[PDB]
């Protein structure tokens, strides 16, 4: 009935920053701009949500407290706590329909919206569970996040496939023009399961990975995924639909293998991109014995040409690509040498780190 708690500033800041992650869109339901604060038994729970996903932080209450719930503006409450001095004791209490924040001789009275109006994701039971290092989840997402579509009619492409198979966790992202797939062993036998996480949920999952050694405990249900890292619980609804099969998109029999230094290739594509068409980003690749030539032309008839010494012994061929798709892959690989496997001018190209097969990229060419 009369929520109250006193908590040291640094036990509140990162939690407040974490639970504010899903907020920031266009104003819809007023309470979506607020954080839900709940004091129950010895815990302060803070929740932020955008209806599709939510982030919850549990903070242990060692100092006197009284139970109850309310919601307050997220940015203002975080800005008050952030603006207070290091070591400030932040005393919070509900006073009628106002939430009072006090520390030293600083006093803030915030407007509130009822906790009964706060959107809670519907009840669900997990069917799959596994625990993995945060570094493995970071690796999986960073290797493939850039290939997800942005607002494609096929809503299942505006997200990332998370697939468990044997002892591996795998991510797949594609927009139908380019595809990225990454697989990592996670040291435990898993059922074969596939879910599509919304792109915003993928970005939220990445943000919650502090880099430390608290493990990431994942729970997957029929329609939701939950990720537990320390005292933070991230939940998101899943995306419906049939995601494409990366096994059927990987080029069948590349008869042409190219190998070059990742950085020399990245810089050559980066420079050629400067004089490519700003909307269509088209570059031509001319592969010949131990040589890769990249050309770029734009509507001003400006032209970039880059010649590289590469390892290549297949047949001579020309193939056009969107340079942003090629650069996204090279930027994501950040290795010493890269391998490009081709078939012909109208077929996809597989690109990968020459020293590792954990991630694979498939880029479809342009008729150029």
């Amino acid at each position: 009935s009369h929520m109250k708690f006193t908590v040291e500033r640094e036990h509140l800041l990162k939690p407040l920053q974490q639970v504010s992650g899903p907020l920031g869109g266009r104003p819809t339901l007023p309470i979506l701009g607020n954080l839900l604060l709940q004091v129950a038994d010895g815990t302060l729970s803070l929740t932020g949500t955008d209806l599709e996903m939510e982030m919850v932080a549990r903070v242990a209450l060692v100092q006197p407290h009284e139970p109850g719930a309310t919601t307050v503006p997220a940015r203002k409450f975080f800005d008050i706590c952030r603006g207070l001095p290091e070591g400030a004791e932040i005393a919070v209490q509900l006073e009628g329909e106002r939430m009072l924040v006090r520390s030293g001789r600083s006093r803030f009275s915030l407007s509130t919206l009822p906790a009964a109006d706060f959107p809670n994701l519907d009840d669900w039971q997990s069917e799959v569970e596994f625990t993995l290092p945060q570094a493995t989840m970071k690796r999986l997402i960073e290797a493939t996040q850039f290939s997800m579509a942005h607002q494609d009619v096929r809503y299942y492409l505006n997200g990332m496939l998370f697939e468990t198979e044997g002892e591996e966790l795998r991510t797949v992202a594609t927009d139908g023009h380019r595809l990225a797939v990454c697989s990592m062993p996670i040291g435990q036998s898993l059922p074969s399961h596939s879910v599509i996480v919304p792109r915003k949920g993928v970005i939220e999952l990445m943000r919650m990975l502090d880099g430390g050694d608290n493990p990431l405990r994942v729970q997957i249900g029929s329609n939701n995924i939950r990720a537990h890292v320390g005292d933070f619980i991230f939940t998101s609804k899943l995306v419906d639909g049939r995601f494409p099969d990366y096994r059927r998109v990987l080029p069948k029999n590349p008869d042409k293998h190219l190998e070059a230094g990742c950085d020399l290739l990245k810089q050559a594509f980066a420079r050629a991109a400067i004089l490519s068409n700003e909307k269509f980003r088209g570059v031509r690749l001319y592969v010949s014995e131990n040589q890769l030539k990249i050309t770029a032309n734009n509507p001003e008839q400006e032209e970039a040409e880059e010649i590289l010494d590469v390892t290549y012994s297949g047949a001579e061929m020309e193939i056009g690509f969107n340079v942003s798709y090629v650069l996204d892959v090279l930027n994501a690989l950040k290795c010493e040498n890269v391998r490009m496997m081709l078939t012909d001018s109208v077929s996809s190209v597989q690109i990968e780190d020459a020293a590792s097969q954990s991630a694979a990229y498939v880029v479809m060419p342009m008729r150029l």
Binding site: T174, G176, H177, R178, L179, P244, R248, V249, F280, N322, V346, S348, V362, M364, P365, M366, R367
Partner: peptide, 6 residues
């Protein structure tokens, strides 16, 4: 034109 993976 950009080709599609499928």
């Amino acid at each position: 034109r950009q080709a599609x993976l499928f």
